[PDB]
mmCIF file of C-alpha atoms and ligand atoms in Angstrom:
data_model
loop_
_atom_site.group_PDB
_atom_site.id
_atom_site.type_symbol
_atom_site.label_atom_id
_atom_site.label_comp_id
_atom_site.label_asym_id
_atom_site.label_seq_id
_atom_site.Cartn_x
_atom_site.Cartn_y
_atom_site.Cartn_z
ATOM 1 C CA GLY A 1 -40.492 5.400 -30.019
ATOM 2 C CA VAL A 2 -36.656 5.812 -30.266
ATOM 3 C CA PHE A 3 -35.577 8.458 -27.541
ATOM 4 C CA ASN A 4 -32.099 9.687 -27.843
ATOM 5 C CA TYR A 5 -29.861 10.636 -24.691
ATOM 6 C CA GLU A 6 -26.276 12.073 -25.169
ATOM 7 C CA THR A 7 -23.622 12.509 -23.294
ATOM 8 C CA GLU A 8 -20.472 14.513 -23.786
ATOM 9 C CA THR A 9 -17.512 13.668 -21.370
ATOM 10 C CA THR A 10 -14.349 15.603 -20.999
ATOM 11 C CA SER A 11 -10.741 13.338 -20.691
ATOM 12 C CA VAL A 12 -7.646 14.536 -19.808
ATOM 13 C CA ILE A 13 -6.351 11.062 -21.835
ATOM 14 C CA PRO A 14 -5.465 11.332 -25.094
ATOM 15 C CA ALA A 15 -8.081 9.918 -27.736
ATOM 16 C CA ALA A 16 -6.015 6.816 -29.154
ATOM 17 C CA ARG A 17 -4.830 5.699 -25.720
ATOM 18 C CA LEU A 18 -8.487 6.731 -24.317
ATOM 19 C CA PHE A 19 -10.086 4.346 -27.176
ATOM 20 C CA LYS A 20 -7.745 1.706 -26.846
ATOM 21 C CA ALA A 21 -8.066 1.154 -22.906
ATOM 22 C CA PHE A 22 -11.443 2.303 -22.294
ATOM 23 C CA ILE A 23 -13.087 1.240 -25.172
ATOM 24 C CA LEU A 24 -11.169 -1.806 -26.418
ATOM 25 C CA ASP A 25 -9.924 -3.302 -23.101
ATOM 26 C CA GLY A 26 -13.060 -2.686 -20.713
ATOM 27 C CA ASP A 27 -13.825 -6.171 -20.244
ATOM 28 C CA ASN A 28 -10.504 -6.265 -18.552
ATOM 29 C CA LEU A 29 -10.030 -3.283 -16.940
ATOM 30 C CA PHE A 30 -13.828 -2.734 -15.526
ATOM 31 C CA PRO A 31 -14.348 -5.516 -13.028
ATOM 32 C CA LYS A 32 -10.334 -4.348 -12.392
ATOM 33 C CA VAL A 33 -10.718 -1.007 -11.722
ATOM 34 C CA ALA A 34 -14.336 -0.735 -10.953
ATOM 35 C CA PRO A 35 -15.399 -3.530 -8.622
ATOM 36 C CA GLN A 36 -18.398 -1.661 -7.037
ATOM 37 C CA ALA A 37 -19.924 -0.782 -10.752
ATOM 38 C CA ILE A 38 -19.141 -4.109 -12.583
ATOM 39 C CA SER A 39 -18.188 -7.465 -10.787
ATOM 40 C CA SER A 40 -17.458 -9.428 -14.149
ATOM 41 C CA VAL A 41 -17.301 -9.251 -17.877
ATOM 42 C CA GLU A 42 -17.568 -12.487 -19.872
ATOM 43 C CA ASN A 43 -17.317 -12.826 -23.548
ATOM 44 C CA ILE A 44 -20.458 -15.230 -24.122
ATOM 45 C CA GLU A 45 -19.837 -15.657 -28.229
ATOM 46 C CA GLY A 46 -17.923 -13.961 -31.062
ATOM 47 C CA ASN A 47 -14.417 -13.099 -30.928
ATOM 48 C CA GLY A 48 -14.948 -9.099 -30.429
ATOM 49 C CA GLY A 49 -15.711 -8.607 -34.027
ATOM 50 C CA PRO A 50 -19.433 -7.227 -34.806
ATOM 51 C CA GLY A 51 -22.149 -9.585 -33.457
ATOM 52 C CA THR A 52 -19.734 -10.756 -30.285
ATOM 53 C CA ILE A 53 -22.145 -11.057 -27.129
ATOM 54 C CA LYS A 54 -20.914 -10.495 -24.043
ATOM 55 C CA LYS A 55 -22.202 -10.332 -20.293
ATOM 56 C CA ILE A 56 -21.429 -7.378 -18.281
ATOM 57 C CA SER A 57 -22.624 -8.761 -14.176
ATOM 58 C CA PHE A 58 -23.190 -6.022 -11.821
ATOM 59 C CA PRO A 59 -22.556 -6.053 -7.809
ATOM 60 C CA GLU A 60 -25.196 -7.221 -5.519
ATOM 61 C CA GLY A 61 -27.394 -4.377 -4.674
ATOM 62 C CA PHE A 62 -27.825 -2.828 -7.873
ATOM 63 C CA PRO A 63 -31.426 -2.640 -9.367
ATOM 64 C CA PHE A 64 -29.803 -5.425 -11.748
ATOM 65 C CA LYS A 65 -28.252 -8.215 -11.699
ATOM 66 C CA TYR A 66 -26.647 -8.400 -15.442
ATOM 67 C CA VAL A 67 -26.846 -7.144 -19.353
ATOM 68 C CA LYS A 68 -25.650 -8.957 -22.563
ATOM 69 C CA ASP A 69 -24.551 -6.478 -24.798
ATOM 70 C CA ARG A 70 -23.562 -6.752 -28.719
ATOM 71 C CA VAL A 71 -20.966 -5.308 -30.932
ATOM 72 C CA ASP A 72 -22.287 -3.580 -33.515
ATOM 73 C CA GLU A 73 -19.160 -2.143 -35.305
ATOM 74 C CA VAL A 74 -15.681 -1.272 -34.361
ATOM 75 C CA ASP A 75 -13.701 2.095 -36.209
ATOM 76 C CA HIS A 76 -10.369 1.696 -34.592
ATOM 77 C CA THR A 77 -8.616 4.825 -36.780
ATOM 78 C CA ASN A 78 -12.241 6.655 -36.107
ATOM 79 C CA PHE A 79 -12.265 6.152 -32.156
ATOM 80 C CA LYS A 80 -16.035 4.862 -33.234
ATOM 81 C CA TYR A 81 -17.876 2.221 -31.252
ATOM 82 C CA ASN A 82 -21.282 1.182 -31.792
ATOM 83 C CA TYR A 83 -22.679 -1.353 -29.350
ATOM 84 C CA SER A 84 -26.414 -2.548 -28.142
ATOM 85 C CA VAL A 85 -27.858 -3.569 -24.857
ATOM 86 C CA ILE A 86 -30.119 -6.399 -25.971
ATOM 87 C CA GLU A 87 -30.953 -8.456 -22.559
ATOM 88 C CA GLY A 88 -30.918 -8.272 -18.823
ATOM 89 C CA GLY A 89 -30.888 -5.141 -16.766
ATOM 90 C CA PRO A 90 -33.431 -2.312 -18.112
ATOM 91 C CA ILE A 91 -34.535 -4.462 -21.087
ATOM 92 C CA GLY A 92 -38.064 -5.520 -20.306
ATOM 93 C CA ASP A 93 -41.400 -4.302 -19.616
ATOM 94 C CA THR A 94 -41.606 -1.215 -22.579
ATOM 95 C CA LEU A 95 -37.642 -1.070 -23.693
ATOM 96 C CA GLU A 96 -36.788 -3.515 -26.105
ATOM 97 C CA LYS A 97 -32.880 -2.723 -26.319
ATOM 98 C CA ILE A 98 -30.707 0.273 -26.220
ATOM 99 C CA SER A 99 -28.322 0.965 -29.115
ATOM 100 C CA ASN A 100 -25.253 3.201 -28.456
ATOM 101 C CA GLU A 101 -22.786 4.713 -30.548
ATOM 102 C CA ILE A 102 -19.485 6.469 -28.917
ATOM 103 C CA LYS A 103 -16.774 8.465 -30.584
ATOM 104 C CA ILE A 104 -13.641 9.798 -28.765
ATOM 105 C CA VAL A 105 -12.468 13.060 -30.021
ATOM 106 C CA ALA A 106 -9.204 14.805 -29.420
ATOM 107 C CA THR A 107 -9.352 18.104 -28.053
ATOM 108 C CA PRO A 108 -6.647 21.299 -28.803
ATOM 109 C CA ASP A 109 -5.101 20.702 -25.290
ATOM 110 C CA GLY A 110 -4.331 17.200 -25.878
ATOM 111 C CA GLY A 111 -6.932 15.602 -24.032
ATOM 112 C CA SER A 112 -10.355 14.032 -25.482
ATOM 113 C CA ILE A 113 -13.901 14.071 -25.547
ATOM 114 C CA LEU A 114 -16.212 10.993 -25.714
ATOM 115 C CA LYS A 115 -19.681 11.835 -27.561
ATOM 116 C CA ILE A 116 -21.953 9.424 -26.610
ATOM 117 C CA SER A 117 -25.225 8.424 -27.346
ATOM 118 C CA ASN A 118 -27.863 6.205 -26.011
ATOM 119 C CA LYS A 119 -30.679 5.530 -28.305
ATOM 120 C CA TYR A 120 -33.624 3.914 -26.502
ATOM 121 C CA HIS A 121 -36.258 1.530 -28.597
ATOM 122 C CA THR A 122 -39.679 1.648 -26.502
ATOM 123 C CA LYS A 123 -42.970 0.398 -26.966
ATOM 124 C CA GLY A 124 -44.829 3.006 -28.806
ATOM 125 C CA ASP A 125 -45.414 6.381 -27.137
ATOM 126 C CA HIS A 126 -43.972 5.278 -23.603
ATOM 127 C CA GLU A 127 -41.326 7.202 -22.431
ATOM 128 C CA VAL A 128 -38.003 5.864 -20.912
ATOM 129 C CA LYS A 129 -37.764 5.432 -17.113
ATOM 130 C CA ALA A 130 -36.255 8.481 -15.499
ATOM 131 C CA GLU A 131 -34.349 6.058 -12.891
ATOM 132 C CA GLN A 132 -32.527 4.446 -16.287
ATOM 133 C CA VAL A 133 -31.263 7.888 -17.764
ATOM 134 C CA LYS A 134 -29.863 8.335 -14.215
ATOM 135 C CA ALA A 135 -28.168 5.241 -13.697
ATOM 136 C CA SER A 136 -27.027 5.136 -17.466
ATOM 137 C CA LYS A 137 -24.947 8.607 -16.628
ATOM 138 C CA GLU A 138 -23.761 7.483 -12.906
ATOM 139 C CA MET A 139 -22.215 4.438 -14.575
ATOM 140 C CA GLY A 140 -20.528 6.609 -17.329
ATOM 141 C CA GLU A 141 -18.861 8.077 -15.102
ATOM 142 C CA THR A 142 -17.757 6.000 -12.419
ATOM 143 C CA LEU A 143 -16.216 3.402 -15.313
ATOM 144 C CA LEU A 144 -14.390 6.277 -17.196
ATOM 145 C CA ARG A 145 -13.315 8.132 -13.707
ATOM 146 C CA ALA A 146 -11.861 4.802 -12.969
ATOM 147 C CA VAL A 147 -9.877 4.050 -16.135
ATOM 148 C CA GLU A 148 -8.789 7.388 -16.221
ATOM 149 C CA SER A 149 -7.281 7.078 -12.969
ATOM 150 C CA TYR A 150 -5.433 3.845 -13.384
ATOM 151 C CA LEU A 151 -4.190 5.314 -17.030
ATOM 152 C CA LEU A 152 -2.749 8.240 -14.672
ATOM 153 C CA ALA A 153 -1.328 5.985 -12.493
ATOM 154 C CA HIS A 154 0.558 3.593 -14.876
ATOM 155 C CA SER A 155 1.972 5.491 -17.664
ATOM 156 C CA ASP A 156 3.599 2.133 -19.574
ATOM 157 C CA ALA A 157 -0.027 1.023 -19.777
ATOM 158 C CA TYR A 158 -1.624 1.412 -23.362
ATOM 159 C CA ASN A 159 1.096 3.093 -25.020
HETATM 160 C C1 LIG B 201 -18.588 -3.349 -21.407
HETATM 161 C C2 LIG B 201 -19.824 -2.926 -21.072
HETATM 162 C C3 LIG B 201 -19.482 -2.201 -20.048
HETATM 163 S S1 LIG B 201 -21.075 -0.429 -19.450
HETATM 164 C C4 LIG B 201 -20.459 0.634 -21.079
HETATM 165 C C5 LIG B 201 -20.823 1.989 -20.772
HETATM 166 O O1 LIG B 201 -21.333 2.237 -19.544
HETATM 167 C C6 LIG B 201 -20.540 3.155 -21.226
HETATM 168 C C7 LIG B 201 -20.654 4.344 -20.959
HETATM 169 N N1 LIG B 201 -19.990 5.690 -21.159
HETATM 170 C C8 LIG B 201 -19.090 4.959 -22.444
HETATM 171 C C9 LIG B 201 -18.865 3.835 -23.118
HETATM 172 C C10 LIG B 201 -19.592 2.751 -22.646
HETATM 173 C C11 LIG B 201 -18.836 1.342 -22.888
HETATM 174 O O2 LIG B 201 -18.247 1.339 -23.804
HETATM 175 C C12 LIG B 201 -20.074 0.141 -22.765
HETATM 176 C C13 LIG B 201 -19.222 -0.901 -22.347
HETATM 177 C C14 LIG B 201 -20.025 -2.122 -22.351
HETATM 178 C C15 LIG B 201 -19.948 -2.474 -23.761
HETATM 179 O O3 LIG B 201 -19.209 -2.679 -24.396
HETATM 180 O O4 LIG B 201 -20.916 -3.598 -24.102
#
């Protein structure tokens, strides 16, 4: 099956700045600002364009050791990022991949919202494991909030 889980996260950070930092520079920021969520991010192949593979490692204790993610598309002006989880972590058993689409939109007050869709490709009619759905929500919050906090503490970053 293909099962879609969506999130709408409100952020006080303006959209262009948040896209530049959180989406396009998380390989740097995530291990820096959220080491208790992500221990390292390593480029595996590619230069950041479509088809680029990276390895995200998690600190010891988490159920998973790593995932490999693939960049699908980046739309720099519309603040849209498409990427897939293709190996490691939850990939195995009845789950083949997670296809993700993130879009950051400005809000009237000058902040932003992140529209997040995670589409899980599972075997047949097998559902996504509830623990995965939960862990994904937790990770997204930890990472976004940590980058937000960094941006608010460092006004000269990503202007
Ligand atoms: C670097 C790796 C980190 S995990 C993940 C993540 O949890 C997340 C959650 N909510 C919105 C956006 C995102 C992410 O941009 C991605 C980034 C992901 C990747 O680019 O391959």
